[PDB]
Design a binder for this molecule. Structure first.
Ligand SMILES: Nc1ncnc2c1ncn2[C@@H]1O[C@H](COP(=O)(O)OP(=O)(O)O)[C@@H](O)[C@H]1O
Ligand SMILES: Nc1ncnc2c1ncn2[C@@H]1O[C@H](COP(=O)(O)OP(=O)(O)O)[C@@H](O)[C@H]1O
Ligand SMILES: Nc1ncnc2c1ncn2[C@@H]1O[C@H](COP(=O)(O)OP(=O)(O)O)[C@@H](O)[C@H]1O
Lengths: 485, 508, 508
């Protein structure tokens, strides 16, 4: 076989890339799903296209998995990643038939990736942080062309307040962000304007009979996985809790009325039937500690958390409000409406903008979209390859000539000819030095993207390019599939 | 890469199947079930559930069309025809390349122009009985036999006029149809007030009762001082004799309350207090209530008590222990009709001059099914007419004008969207052509005559399905619902665009 | 029913085959013979004549098209494309009824309107060198390489301008094309006078004859002997070996008669006695007459002899005598040329300067043939342009304007003939579409641009076959022949009608 397996891997890559090659941009074409029962599905998202379809080649499965891992890590761009990986692996066919080794192709690809990273970081336009002006500009750019255009006025300020609720100050300046610790509260009913924000953890579980001192002006939460029983003949654990004198002790087991009285004797409030995804955020926002081994029990078993507790039964259901938490890293965000069919999408795009914001804290940079960045980096590579020599110059140039697939498909699924427009775009992108124009996705006409008003986060573009290059090198590094069939 | 051809072919096949159904002269379809049951129908709302559809995308079109026309219930066949014609017109240009996205842009622009044009051809008037009669006639002749629909038109329009409280639309519960199996169709009459499905056949039921009252009864002869209805505890001796006494005293201890209430309301049931029970009652209790003018009845339906609660006043709850005399349901007049075999209870002059019911009647299910869905379509169409204040001419008159307006608007749009609106305007003409074809006239000659008439005179002229001549469609009274046409445009454009935008059908 | 569909399919197939030849940017086709000879060309006439067509009705269409094109100058491929699109448009409506007679009446009405419109569109610009240069360029760039066409334009226009002096329509006989195989094809110009095909084996008779007289009369220096006596050299060999003699005396008598004519009418040994024979002549008497200044030549075909008669003069007969010098003619220069191994006789500066030949020096056979046919087509086009004295814009232009006139004239006609008028218009749309497609641009985009520009300009506008944008053919210099357009409309309508009128196919 030899290079036959390489060709097979990249052929599977190509035949899986062009499946979803058409469904990107603001004018994505629809796809047909024909399950073996007779049903038919309308679909615009290539992610669901790949998820529903079944494949048999390990290369295709690995690429689908990498597309997923990129999806739940950084958010969008999965279709772009698949398209780019397929394009590079397809243009590697020419060199793999030159009887020339995959290792030099790999080295050329890595050099090309490094140069593309450099030229993106060079071409990126800066943006301000903590300023609503270009935050709303980014909202108009990327957060639009979604189902949010009717509810952008609320999504924008929800995200803009939410940017300062999940910060970790570990090693630098607010560079750490965690994703699930934001207390999402999605509940239908009422008007959508009722959606708001709160600094603290919002727990949907509550005590059955709140006839006790539930709220105290300084909750010192203690976590415990033990189960509260009737008494010792276990009150011994309660007696040991009395030693450090806390006011709230969080458990994960039911509490009886007599158990309630035994607890309020120690003046501690327990909770039941709570979730681990709630307990972890409670501990994060309160900085508490869990311990039950008597030898380890010291003065460190009690950690002060919030400073104000409140319970409100909004619509005869048991809420629990824990406001003014010690650590504002797991805080409440509220969602209201009628159906969760769109509010979920609006939410997810808002935390996409959240990741945009945290990267802006890291690199406050935006790259011109609509194929502008792709052609800019292609020009950078092509002009860069002139000086460098060696047999690996051909793959270095071919990667650049391959990455222009994004504007090509943007033009293609718009009606306009993909040849003349691409040639004109290159023409006004080489000799024109300080322009970096792009192609309009709607009308299929060249337009300077500084005027149209479309931009993309630097980090998502960097992640897409890096994942595409790593996928290409991974599929070029596989020399045998055989461990069986 | 051309699965658009497959989709277009299947859509055209569906168009061919659902053709020959429009207008009063449409050919009925013959729905036979797998078991052997038969069904005759013409409307697409139920026809798009024709057991087998074969082609999957045809099933998709059927599903979306039904799900979206459930809000108006009159544009189904028209929707399918216009979808098929839009796809064919698009194909004539897709065959020569011409990527479908700009075709979609043209379709959207043409839809905007057509919606703008619709707002000035609609006529808004203080519609009266005759206008609703014409609307019901137009909606009924196109779903049932021509002569038969004439008698149903009156029973529909007067019922809707009685039901119409104010600007608020009607309610689905507020008009109810009834099923019965008389040998002859014997037209269909309108009954003010609720009509009860079943009743007890005791010889001493009071027929003529005025200013009566009513209460619902759940369980009265099974368990003593217990609301549970189940098997008898024969094994338990104390329970066995308790249930035997439940036959007598469990009903007597509240028959005494009923009779004292009826006496203290009117001497010895002077106004004739009436009762209703969920199930059968004790034969001795039945005799006593018949002799006391109480009219015991059984086989109560779950849809009766909640409808009559706000209709007959009070609350006729299932449970016993009437106690406070407030829950009793007033009835100005009650009658017992026993046509042929089955007996029926007519609750008239209740505490509502509304909530009337129809009396559709005829041969075995093969005909009464058509009666019921045709009268339902007529009621929904006249409900749309009662909701909006504007109505539009029918017989395809509006669509010829729409096509003319779009053609005149075609040069305004630049690019190939010009060609898209051309295709859309050409495809909107399918309904007049199909209407002319279904009556046996020449398909193109009638359309040419209609177009010439509308060009020389601004009147919205339409096709006449008895002579193949251009007819004014305003004086004749062939009006169609405005909202139906609007939803028709909205549905057809979106379905056509979605089907045109697909490619690379995949086996999931 | 089905024969019509078969004919439609065959005509569409022929149109698809011939599509990629219209326009100067069209791609040529290669004709390989069964023997192995290869011919590469693009002219519609030769493609239809030499193609190995399979479909019978396609062969019929080709035959009638070439037969009618033999009348006018050219325009065959456009005619075939228009026939194909006419048939497709007609079938588009015949599929839904529309007995073909209706479409035929629409076609004839549209033809009348188009002829009228072309009457009001023609340009009556006068005679000049530059317009005929443009006409030659238009007729030549559509047949051969661009630079070669630019070279040929000057020669063709100058030749026709020279022949124009008579002020009557004249061509064909008076302009001849000579064939030779020089390596360098750049050598191509007019040779005022006449060039003979080949000379004879003669050592330095005269070279530069200068002024001379021509008498021809098929000199018999190799006069027909008495070889034929009985079959061959039989036992009576003395017949064909000795009786074959006594005819050299006739040859010598002819030699003295030529001598008498020479030193009787010439007055000296100079003033060359130009004579040409259809058969061979012995070199001995040839050089004997050459030493006396007699220009003796042999082995020429008839056509050059009748050409000499109308240009210089002289009788023609193998056996002759001392005839009168009445038929004798004079030439200014009878210079003889030789290139490598073949000899050319340049009979120049003769009386009757109407006779003019053209020089072509193509390297191989097929290039020579292609240049010959391109020159012939250019000559026919310029002849037509001079004859009618009126030219029309090319690059479409007239097609789209006729389409607009027909479309605005559609409501004027009555009956269903509007369908035929619309089909005819959409068929005339094919030419600009084919030009745009062959250039490399998009069909509908270019068509929309052209029509939109024509909308508010009024002036004729056509396709610029290098950038695709609309262009006014008057300013650029693209011209067509009015008679060509007339014949195009007539023939396309006639053939399309004849194909549409058929209903059944039967063997015979
Ligand atoms: N209005 C627009 N005009 C031109 N291009 C656009 C526009 N909106 C988005 N794009 C392009 O779409 C691309 C990303 O879309 P896509 O990857 O399909 O979405 P996702 O990232 O959710 O998969 C970007 O490269 C961007 O240039
Ligand atoms: N008497 C009539 N004259 C002319 N057209 C009629 C008449 N009655 C009904 N129609 C036509 O029938 C069409 C409505 O029937 P249809 O849309 O087939 O109902 P559904 O779609 O619910 O089956 C209307 O377009 C109307 O023009
Ligand atoms: N320079 C040009 N630009 C655009 N169109 C041209 C040009 N020259 C010729 N044409 C078009 O080509 C057509 C003639 O081509 P063709 O049919 O091959 O010639 P014929 O059939 O007469 O030999 C004319 O209708 C003319 O409009």
């Amino acid at each position: 076989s030899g290079r036959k397996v390489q060709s097979g891997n990249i052929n599977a890559a190509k035949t899986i890339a062009d499946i979803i090659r058409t469904c990107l941009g603001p004018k994505s074409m629809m796809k047909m799903l024909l399950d073996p029962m007779g049903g038919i599905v309308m679909t615009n998202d290539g992610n669901a296209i790949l998820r529903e379809i079944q494949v048999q080649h390990p290369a295709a499965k690995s690429m689908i998995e990498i597309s997923r891992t990129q999806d739940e890590e950084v958010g969008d761009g999965t279709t772009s990643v698949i398209i780019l990986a397929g394009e590079m692996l397809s243009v590697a066919e020419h060199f793999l038939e030159q009887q020339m080794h995959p290792t030099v192709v790999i080295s050329a690809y890595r050099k090309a990736l490094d140069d593309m990273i450099s030229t993106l970081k060079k071409i990126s336009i800066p943006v301000d942080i903590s300023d609503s002006d270009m935050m709303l500009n980014i909202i108009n750019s990327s957060i639009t062309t979604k189902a949010i255009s009717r509810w952008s006025s609320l999504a924008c300020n929800i995200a803009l307040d939410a940017v300062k609720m999940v910060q970790f100050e570990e090693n630098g300046r607010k560079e750490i962000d965690i994703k699930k610790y934001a207390r999402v509260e999605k509940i239908p009913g009422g008007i959508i304007e009722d959606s708001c924000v709160l600094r603290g953890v919002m727990i949907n579980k509550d005590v059955t009979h709140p006839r006790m001192r539930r709220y105290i002006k300084n909750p010192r939460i203690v976590l415990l996985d033990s189960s509260l029983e009737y008494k010792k003949g276990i009150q011994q654990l309660c007696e040991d809790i009395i030693q450090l004198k806390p006011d709230v002790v969080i458990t994960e087991k039911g509490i009886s009325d007599l158990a309630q009285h035994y607890l309020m004797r120690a003046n501690i409030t327990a909770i039941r039937r709570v979730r681990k995804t709630d307990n972890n955020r409670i501990a994060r926002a309160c900085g508490a500690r869990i311990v039950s081994r008597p030898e380890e029990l010291r003065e460190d078993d009690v950690g002060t958390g919030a400073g104000l507790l409140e319970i409100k039964k909004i619509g005869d259901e048991y809420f629990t409000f824990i406001t003014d938490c010690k650590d504002p890293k797991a805080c409440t965000i509220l969602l209201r409406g009628a159906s969760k069919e769109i509010l979920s999408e609006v939410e997810r795009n808002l935390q996409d903008a959240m990741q945009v914001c945290r990267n802006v804290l890291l690199d406050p940079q935006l790259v011109p979209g609509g194929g502008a960045s792709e052609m800019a980096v292609a020009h950078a590579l092509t002009e860069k390859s002139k000086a460098m020599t060696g047999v690996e110059q051909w793959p270095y140039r071919a990667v650049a000539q391959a990455l222009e697939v994004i504007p090509r498909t943007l033009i293609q699924n718009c009606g306009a000819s993909t040849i003349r427009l691409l040639t004109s775009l290159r023409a006004k992108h080489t000799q024109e030095n300080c322009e970096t124009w792009g192609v309009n996705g709607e009308t299929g006409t060249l337009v300077d993207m500084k005027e149209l008003g479309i931009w993309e986060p630097l980090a998502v573009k960097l992640q897409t390019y890096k994942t595409a290059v790593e996928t290409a090198v991974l599929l070029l590094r596989i020399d045998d599939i055989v461990s069986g069939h | 890469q051309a699965a658009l051809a497959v989709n277009i072919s299947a859509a055209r096949g569906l168009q061919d199947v659902l053709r020959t159904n429009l207008g009063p002269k449409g050919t009925m379809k013959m729905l036979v079930s797998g078991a052997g049951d038969i069904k005759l129908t013409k409307d697409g709302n139920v026809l798009l559930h024709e057991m087998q559809i074969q082609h999957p995308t045809a099933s998709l079109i059927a599903k979306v069309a039904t799900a979206q026309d459930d809000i108006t219930g009159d544009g189904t066949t028209s929707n399918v025809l216009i979808i098929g014609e839009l796809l064919k017109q698009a194909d004539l240009y897709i065959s020569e390349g011409l990527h479908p996205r700009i075709i979609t842009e043209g379709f959207e622009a043409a839809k905007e122009k057509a919606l703008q044009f619709l707002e000035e051809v609609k006529v808004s008037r203080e519609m009266d009985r005759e206008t609703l009669i014409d609307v019901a006639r137009t909606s009924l002749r196109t779903k049932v036999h021509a002569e038969l629909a004439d008698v149903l038109t009156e029973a529909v329009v007067d019922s809707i006029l009685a039901i119409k409280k104010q600007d608020e639309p009607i309610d689905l519960f507020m008009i109810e149809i009834m099923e019965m199996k008389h040998k002859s169709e014997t037209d269909t009459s309108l009954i003010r007030g609720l009509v009860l499905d079943h009743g007890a056949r005791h010889p001493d039921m009071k027929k003529r009762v005025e200013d009566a009252y009513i209460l619902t009864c759940n369980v009265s002869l099974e368990y003593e001082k217990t609301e549970v209805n189940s098997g008898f505890f024969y094994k338990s001796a104390e329970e066995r004799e308790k249930l035997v006494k439940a036959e007598r005293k469990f009903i007597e201890d509240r028959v005494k309350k009923i009779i004292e209430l009826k006496r203290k309301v009117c001497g010895d049931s002077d106004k004739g207090f009436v009762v209703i029970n969920q199930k059968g009652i004790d034969p001795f209790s039945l005799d006593a209530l018949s002799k006391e003018g109480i009219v015991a009845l059984r086989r109560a339906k779950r849809r009766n008590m909640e409808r009559l609660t706000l209709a007959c006043g009070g609350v006729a709850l299932n449970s016993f222990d009437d106690l406070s005399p407030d829950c009793l349901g007033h009835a100005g007049l009650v009658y017992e009709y026993t046509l042929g075999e089955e007996k029926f209870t007519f609750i008239e002059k209740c505490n509502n001059p509304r909530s009337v019911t129809l009396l559709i009647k005829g041969p075995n299910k093969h005909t009464l099914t058509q009666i019921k869905d045709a009268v339902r379509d007529g009621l929904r169409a006249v409900k749309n007419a009662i909701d909006d204040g504007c109505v539009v001419p029918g017989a395809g008159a509006v669509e010829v004008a729409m096509a003319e307006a779009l053609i005149k608007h075609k040069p305004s749009v630049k690019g190939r969207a010009q060609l898209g609106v051309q295709a859309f305007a050409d495809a909107l003409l399918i309904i007049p052509k199909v209407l002319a074809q279904n009556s046996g006239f020449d398909l193109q000659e009638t359309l040419v005559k209609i177009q010439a008439e509308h060009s020389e005179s601004g009147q919205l002229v339409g096709v006449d399905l008895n002579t193949g001549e251009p007819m004014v469609a305003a004086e004749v009274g062939v009006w169609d619902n405005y909202c139906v046409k609007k939803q028709l445009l909205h549905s057809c454009t979106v379905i056509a665009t979605n089907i045109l935008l697909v490619d690379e059908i995949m086996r999931a």
